[PDB]
Design a protein around this ligand. Structure first.
Ligand code: A9X
Ligand code: A9X
Lengths: 179, 179
């Protein structure tokens, strides 16, 4: 109950509070200096929350239609001993019927792999802690001033290896255009 | 009790497990390509754990005798959506009587600023959660295979603004030489 609470706050306090306020400027810099009226990167950080807590230690999205396209201009800031601590972010192209249907900054919510490491608790405890985590992070980001149409939490659960994350994400980017 | 548990595991799982196994190689690369038989960077990551949980959002060590000297060769690895996620680390010179008495990679344990944010709980709850955090992290790092004379946890508490972190650290680096 509290592991998930504490991880949400720490993720917000140790990471999002630091990268969110400048994300939208880095994104416009890319969108100018680089880059099609559909291939413009969404002005939002999209945060992947596998409910099964299986966050890959690489780029594997398992969704043939989510591909790495470019890195974002890196932000640098001093933080907690580390001079010019670098903040790396990655842009992904989203495809529908083999065509590029949009583009966004994507990454996984890494505190979840700590819940995975603690269940691999039981698998049902894993799931409830992932939900609590999502619900806490959503509420933190709601009252958080650094969070103003710059952040979307994509929580999902694939029922098997053979069962469309791309479509899910794509819906969120469509709703951005129609707004 | 569990916030501190979970933050220790996440710090270990989200960060130390990823940077510790290569830290000592990055350190030798510096120690050759750069750099005095005393001015060689300690082959250890030193991790500052203010028990008061006051981790600065900058480089402030408040110890005139702990100064930024150089950055470490940055490590890059794919992780959790982010391609070539960069790992930045900073080297500090340690001074005694105005002379450089040693050198080490230093940084603060950032999960602590999440305990700070939650107490600024009461200040005594803050302190116990910081201790629990230290004790959990120490035990994790003991059975952790990635952690083999590459990591030291410096926990301390300054009683006031006018009251020697440098000496504390310096003792740990001396004990390394005499071993
Ligand atoms: C893949 C990119 C991420 C994003 C990232 O850099 C950080 C995550 C994070 C989480 C914390 O608590 C949950 C925390 O507490 C101080 C500090 C940080 Se920084 C990664 O995990 O490497
Ligand atoms: C100043 C340098 C640090 C070190 C660092 O990068 C990370 C810390 C961290 C902590 C986590 O839980 C506690 C976590 O859970 C996924 C991931 C990370 Se990455 C910083 O906080 O920026």
């Amino acid at each position: 109950f509290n592991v998930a609470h504490g991880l949400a706050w720490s993720y917000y306090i140790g990471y999002l509070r630091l990268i969110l306020p400048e994300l939208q400027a880095r994104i416009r810099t890319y969108n100018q200096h680089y880059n099609l009226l559909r291939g413009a990167v969404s002005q939002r950080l999209y945060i992947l929350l596998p409910l099964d807590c299986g966050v890959p230690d690489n780029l594997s999205m398992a969704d043939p239609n989510i591909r790495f396209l470019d890195k974002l201009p890196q932000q640098t800031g001093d933080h907690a001993g580390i001079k010019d601590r670098v903040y790396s972010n990655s842009i992904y192209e989203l495809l529908e019927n083999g065509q590029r249907a949009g583009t966004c900054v994507l990454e996984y919510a890494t505190p979840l792999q700590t819940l995975f490491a603690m269940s691999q608790f039981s698998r049902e405890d894993r799931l409830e802690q992932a939900k609590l985590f999502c619900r806490t992070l959503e509420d933190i980001l709601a009252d958080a001033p650094e969070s103003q149409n710059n952040c979307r939490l994509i929580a999902y659960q694939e029922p098997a290896d053979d069962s469309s994350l791309s479509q899910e994400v794509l819906r969120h980017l469509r709703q951005e255009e129609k707004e």
